[PDB]
Structures are given as structure tokens and as C-alpha cells.
Design a protein around this motif. Structure first.
Motif, PDB file in Angstrom:
ATOM      1  N   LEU A 110       6.889 -16.766-110.059  1.00 30.71           N
ATOM      2  CA  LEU A 110       8.245 -16.538-110.776  1.00 30.71           C
ATOM      3  C   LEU A 110       9.090 -16.127-109.385  1.00 30.71           C
ATOM      4  O   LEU A 110       8.750 -15.430-108.556  1.00 30.71           O
ATOM      5  CB  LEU A 110       8.188 -15.317-111.585  1.00 30.71           C
ATOM      6  N   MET A 111      10.403 -16.741-109.650  1.00 33.26           N
ATOM      7  CA  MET A 111      11.398 -16.459-108.734  1.00 33.26           C
ATOM      8  C   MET A 111      12.779 -16.350-109.178  1.00 33.26           C
ATOM      9  O   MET A 111      13.009 -16.937-110.275  1.00 33.26           O
ATOM     10  CB  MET A 111      11.351 -17.757-107.657  1.00 33.26           C
ATOM     11  N   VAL A 112      13.594 -15.743-108.519  1.00 40.95           N
ATOM     12  CA  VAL A 112      14.955 -15.414-109.040  1.00 40.95           C
ATOM     13  C   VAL A 112      15.937 -15.850-107.662  1.00 40.95           C
ATOM     14  O   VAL A 112      15.765 -15.451-106.510  1.00 40.95           O
ATOM     15  CB  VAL A 112      15.091 -14.084-109.537  1.00 40.95           C
ATOM     16  N   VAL A 113      16.827 -16.616-107.864  1.00 38.35           N
ATOM     17  CA  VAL A 113      17.992 -17.259-107.045  1.00 38.35           C
ATOM     18  C   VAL A 113      19.426 -16.774-107.525  1.00 38.35           C
ATOM     19  O   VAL A 113      19.616 -16.672-108.562  1.00 38.35           O
ATOM     20  CB  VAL A 113      17.619 -18.712-106.517  1.00 38.35           C
ATOM     21  N   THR A 114      20.229 -16.993-106.366  1.00 41.55           N
ATOM     22  CA  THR A 114      21.637 -16.874-106.652  1.00 41.55           C
ATOM     23  C   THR A 114      21.986 -17.954-107.797  1.00 41.55           C
ATOM     24  O   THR A 114      21.736 -19.254-107.686  1.00 41.55           O
ATOM     25  CB  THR A 114      22.480 -16.935-105.547  1.00 41.55           C
TER      26      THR A 114
END
Lengths: 436, 57
Positions: A414-418
Motif C-alpha cells: 500500500l502506498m500514499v502519494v501527493t
């Protein structure tokens, strides 16, 4: 910013021109660290450069970090310049102009900084030191009230524009008075010498708009810094622009003058403190502040971060509560600034204790500060649609290369980016599948 | 009364050893996804009616 940071970014020619005045050289020398001063004094009476290794052997091996820092600071300030010693060696020699001016300031020689004072005789309307101090305090209080927005304090238009250019207050619409921002509150919470130095630095930065000589202004300011309190100086001998600048100082309370055309000006205590009182706040373990002040400025400053309880004609009793500190923080004031302000204004009685302020109160204030920042929020886009680890790794590496990654978790893929980089990441992901 | 007390003090001892798990698992077991406009996919949880709307690349 401090003086060293401002002087670091100046061109070598400006620094050399600054060293042409003995007053500037003394201020620069006093701004040096303790180790640098000894090196300057040792090399003051040397007409030949010294090897770098010889200088490096003066300080012990354990304190080599301080020696390196001092050498780097001296090189940045261009106090000394490396000399090509014959035989491939490197020699260290102080700047001849700086050394000559420092010797003139210390030993003597040349003409005096001021032209003369006895030519015109005693001043007909001379004042005293308490009167000058009262005038400076009144001017500073008026300036700070105008920063607050009190109608009782009115200043010149250019002074108001200077505050707007400094970012302390913003003018949303023409005509309407500007509103003080969080930076204005931080400036108010700063110490008076720090506030004066910041204002002078802003003036120096904005002087390029007026096309005024930075070297002359700095030399005059440094000369005022070492000027003896209660002694007048000759207005004559200065350029037309500098006198105008002096007039602005007349509005700032640093310099007192009866009339614009008058040839006598008295430097004030604030001008002397610019180069670098007893405190009037008593802090108790029960979160109570006892202030020995009467001006509305200090009362407002204390009420910014505290709740007022009683106002005796010569005393202020306030209580420091969690709600008041939270409101002050929401206004933009950090706990460190509040602690520094309390320490600066601390009563001389509290100075007897080994700590200036009780540790419990400072710890409680710091903990209250961390309450607001306990929760972290990051707006963004979450990707959780990775079928294979290899595909996840490539996209994660691309996001890290783009520098738009907010959070990564390879365990769950799982990843979170702008949101700004979301389009770039999506374009990269589409190209990888299409080209496959 | 003493007989009642001495049987009560051991009545709940066996009872306290019966129950093992108190917290109820709230795992969201979403069913088949529903495709709406603009490439939107919605998953409905069968345990509590929880809805999750997302965009699939």
C-alpha cells in the motif's frame, strides 16, 4: 537571521569597504567566537603569513571541531586571506585594511569617528539620560501599538509600508488598515534587541529599492552602536541620503533630535543595545504571573498567552491556563517563543534560582504545545491495487524518484502519494502496461 | 446466609472461565464490486453495510 548570516552573502568588495571603518571592524571582531578572537589578537601584530599547520597546532586535537568552525567562519567573513607561501606552502595573513582599521580602533591614530562637538558649544535644549530613555520607550511603544492597530498610535506612511514589506502586517485592500499576521505576533514576542536587529536587517534588505549605499548605512549604524550614551554628535559630515535614514531612526527612537535642521543628535540606549533590562515578571509554580508593569503594551503581550485576573495600579496578576496557551498557539505563537519571552522579562528575584524558570511550568507549556500537533493529517491518494510485489516495487521506486511519495508500506503493498504527483504516477503506470 | 455466601463465592468462578473472546471482529467482507460512471468501483460490506468507492487504474 543574525549578523554573520547577513555578512556571509555579501560580495568581497562590500566586505572590504565595510572594513574601511574602524567601528565596523570592532563589531565584527566582537561578533567572532571566543577562539577566533584569540587568533585575531595573535595575528594583529604580524607582517608575515603563517603556515596553516602552525595555526592548526594551536588548538588541541579534541577541540579540532571548534578550530575548524572558527577557521571556516573567518574565511567566510574574509577577515584573513590565504597567501601562497614560497615552496608550495600556504600562509595565513589578516586583511591589511581590516588589520589597520582594527589597530586604529584599538591602539589609536587617524581622525576621530565624529567631526567635533565643542565647535557649537553646549546644547541650548539638551536633555538627560532618563529623558532619552523615556523618549525611546515611548517611541517603541507607539511603534508596537501601531503594529497592533491601536488608533492612538499613528506613524509615517513609509514606516507602515516597511512593515508591510517585512510581512508582519498585510494590507488586503487599499485604505483599510493592515492586519497583523502570525509573524507579527512572533516579532512582538521577540526580545527588544532581537526586534531592533530584525527591523534593521529588513531596512538593509529594502534599502536596495531606495538605492542607498549599504556600506555607509552599516558603518553609521555600527558607529552609533559604540556611541557613548548622553553625548551628542555632529550631524555634519554625512551624505544627504544617510541623514534621511537618520530621520527614520528619529522615528524609531534610536536617535533623538530636536529638529530636522539641528546639528546635534543624541544616540539613545536602544541604539547602544542594538550591538548586543532587569525584568518585571514573577512566575510562580501555581501557573501565576505577577508583572510589575503599567503600559498597555506589556499587558496586551502577557494577555496574548495568559488569562488576566487582577490589575493593580502598579501590578498585574494573571493565570496561565491550558485554554489561553492553546489560543495563543492557534494565533501562531510557539511555546519556545513564550518561554524565551518569560525568561527575558523574568524578575531579578527569580534569577537567584539555578533555573530562570521552574522546569514544571516550561514542561507543561511544551506539552500543551504538542497537543495541537498530536494528530497528523496528509491529504493525498492511496494506491492499494498491486497484484505483484515486482510491479509495486517499480512504481514505488518511480514515486521516490519523483519525490511525491508520502507513505510507503511494502508489507501490505500500500502506498500514499501527493495528489499533484498522482497524474504523473498514473501516466507512468499506464506506459509500463501499454509498453509491456 | 453463610451457606448462600459460600456457594455464591464459587458460583461465578466457573462462569468467569466460560467466555473467552469479548471483542467482536469487525472485518469488512466486501462482495462483488459495482461499476459506476467515471471508472468508479463500489464495494459493499456484507457485515455492516459499509461502502467503499474507489477508482481503478
Amino acid at each position: 537571521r543574525n549578523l554573520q548570516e547577513f555578512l556571509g552573502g555579501l560580495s568581497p568588495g562590500v566586505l572590504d569597504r565595510l572594513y574601511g571603518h574602524p567601528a565596523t571592524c570592532l563589531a565584527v571582531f566582537r561578533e567572532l567566537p571566543s577562539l577566533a578572537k584569540n587568533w585575531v589578537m595573535r595575528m594583529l601584530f604580524l607582517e608575515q603569513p603563517l603556515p596553516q599547520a602552525a595555526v592548526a597546532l594551536w588548538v588541541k586535537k579534541e577541540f579540532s571541531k571548534a578550530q575548524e568552525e572558527s577557521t571556516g567562519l573567518l574565511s567566510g567573513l574574509r577577515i584573513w586571506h590565504t597567501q601562497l607561501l614560497p615552496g608550495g606552502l600556504q600562509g595565513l595573513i589578516l586583511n591589511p585594511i581590516f588589520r589597520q582599521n582594527l589597530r586604529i580602533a584599538l591602539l589609536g591614530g587617524g581622525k576621530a569617528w565624529s567631526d567635533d562637538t565643542s565647535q557649537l558649544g553646549p546644547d541650548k535644549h539638551a536633555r538627560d539620560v532618563p529623558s532619552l530613555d523615556k523618549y525611546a520607550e515611548e517611541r517603541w511603544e507607539v511603534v508596537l501599538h501601531f503594529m497592533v492597530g491601536s488608533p492612538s498610535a499613528a506613524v509615517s506612511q513609509d514606516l507602515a509600508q516597511l512593515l508591510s514589506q517585512a510581512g508582519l502586517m498585510k494590507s488586503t485592500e487599499p485604505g483599510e488598515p493592515p492586519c497583523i499576521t502570525s509573524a507579527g505576533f512572533q516579532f512582538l514576542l521577540l526580545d527588544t534587541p532581537a526586534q531592533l536587529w530584525y527591523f534593521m536587517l529588513q531596512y538593509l534588505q529594502t534599502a536596495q529599492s531606495r538605492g542607498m549605499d549599504l556600506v555607509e548605512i552599516l558603518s553609521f549604524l555600527f558607529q552609533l552602536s559604540f556611541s557613548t550614551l548622553g553625548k551628542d554628535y555632529s550631524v555634519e559630515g554625512m551624505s544627504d541620503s544617510l541623514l534621511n535614514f537618520l530621520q527614520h531612526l528619529r522615528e524609531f527612537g534610536l536617535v533623538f533630535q530636536r529638529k530636522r535642521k539641528s546639528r546635534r543628535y543624541y544616540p539613545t540606549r536602544l541604539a547602544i543595545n542594538l550591538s548586543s533590562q532587569p525584568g518585571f515578571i514573577v512566575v510562580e509554580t501555581n501557573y501565576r504571573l505577577y508583572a510589575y508593569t503599567e503600559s498597555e503594551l506589556q499587558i496586551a503581550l502577557i494577555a496574548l498567552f495568559s488569562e488576566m485576573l487582577y490589575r493593580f495600579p502598579n501590578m498585574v496578576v494573571a493565570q496561565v491556563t491550558r485554554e489561553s496557551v492553546q489560543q495563543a498557539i492557534a494565533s501562531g505563537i510557539t511555546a519556545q517563543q513564550i518561554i524565551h519571552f518569560l525568561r527575558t522579562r523574568a524578575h531579578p528575584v527569580m534569577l537567584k534560582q539555578t533555573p530562570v524558570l521552574p522546569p514544571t511550568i516550561t514542561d507543561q507549556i511544551r506539552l500543551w504545545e504538542l497537543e495541537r500537533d498530536r494528530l497528523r493529517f496528509t491529504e493525498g491518494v492511496l494506491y492499494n491495487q498491486f497484484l505483484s510485489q515486482v510491479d509495486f516495487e517499480l512504481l514505488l521506486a518511480h514515486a521516490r524518484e519523483l519525490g511525491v511519495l508520502v507513505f510507503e508500506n511494502s508489507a501490505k503493498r500500500l502506498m500514499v502519494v501527493t495528489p499533484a504527483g498522482h497524474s504523473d504516477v498514473k501516466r507512468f503506470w499506464k506506459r509500463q502496461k501499454h509498453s509491456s | 446466609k453463610k451457606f448462600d455466601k459460600k456457594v455464591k463465592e464459587l458460583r461465578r468462578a466457573v462462569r468467569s472461565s466460560v467466555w473467552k473472546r469479548e471483542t467482536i471482529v469487525h472485518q469488512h467482507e466486501y462482495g462483488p464490486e459495482e461499476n459506476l460512471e467515471d471508472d468508479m468501483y463500489r464495494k459493499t460490506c456484507t457485515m455492516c453495510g459499509h461502502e467503499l468507492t474507489y477508482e481503478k487504474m
